[PDB]
Amino acid sequence: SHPDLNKLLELWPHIQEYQDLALKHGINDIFQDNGGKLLQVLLITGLTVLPGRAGNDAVDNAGQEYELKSINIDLTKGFSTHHHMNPVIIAKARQVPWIFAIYRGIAIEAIYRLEPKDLEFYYDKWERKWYSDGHKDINNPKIPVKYVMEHGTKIY
Template sequence: MAKHPDWDKLEKLMPAVREFQALASEHGIDDVFQDNGGKILQMLLALNLQGIPGREGNDAVDIEGREYELKSVNIHLTAGFSTNHHVNIPIIEKYRQAQWVFAVYEGIEMRRAFAVATEKLEAHFSKWEKQRTETGKDINNPKIPLNFVCNNGETLYDDGRPLDLKAAAAIRRERTKESANRRKAKAEAVADLRGDPAVGDNPVAVVRRREKRQTR
């Protein structure tokens, strides 16, 4: 299969990417392309923290041994900080013992980082704890709102440029509209195909049926 014309550009960039990964590995990040690894590295270096290797437990530690949960959000995509896809009682207790830092991104640019005191997050923890106890089911990624963090956090990092949350919200609304339009266009295209007697089966299905017949 022929490579994309931009393959050579990517290959020229790879030495810098490998250096980026080597730096990340020194700070306990195994893969900068997974689990927000690249952004976690930015946060660690901006805040003078050390990453804790492994997928379990908290993300980082400071010189005094305090452990940190590091969360980030791209405000062009969403207005809530993700937590965990299986929030349960042990995870909530772990959250209560940690320090919390939230980084605000525009794309890949870190614009702000806020520390939020754990006691200010207790209302969220208590709500999740009550829900988990009542339902008996893990909670799928409850969010911590961006506005809550901005209003209750202490600024740890500021890139010095104005942060326009209203403009970011407008970008999110436009992207939501584009996504809805795309889903609508797809549904209309499928309906057109199903209603046109001249349209045959899709090529993937044809190939799969042929392969199935050959293996019988």
């Protein structure tokens, strides 16, 4: 074993407390799919993830659905979307507003909200390309951070 293991065990009970808090709010694993980050976004905005959901999508008090995305700006400048983008995937996205959280490693920096109308620009681009390519799935096209900051409404 490595020497740092002693530090790990010392921090552990606190990490378990975090996992417990996450469980209390519908998140089963803080170590996958940005789980530990999703929790922070939910408590700041007041949104909720329901049991039986399909991924990182949430609802507010009035029942409105939202798609949540996170980026680490210390590494990249474009938000990931789907590793197999096509019209069926886009169809799931079209009607709901998106919530974009910006992170500096682990420190939350800002949160933006974009409406479907502010995103049609990209849906049209991807759809237009999918056809041209002979119906080839697009491997993870990106949405630029600058675009989000310029067209969206800052809520944090």
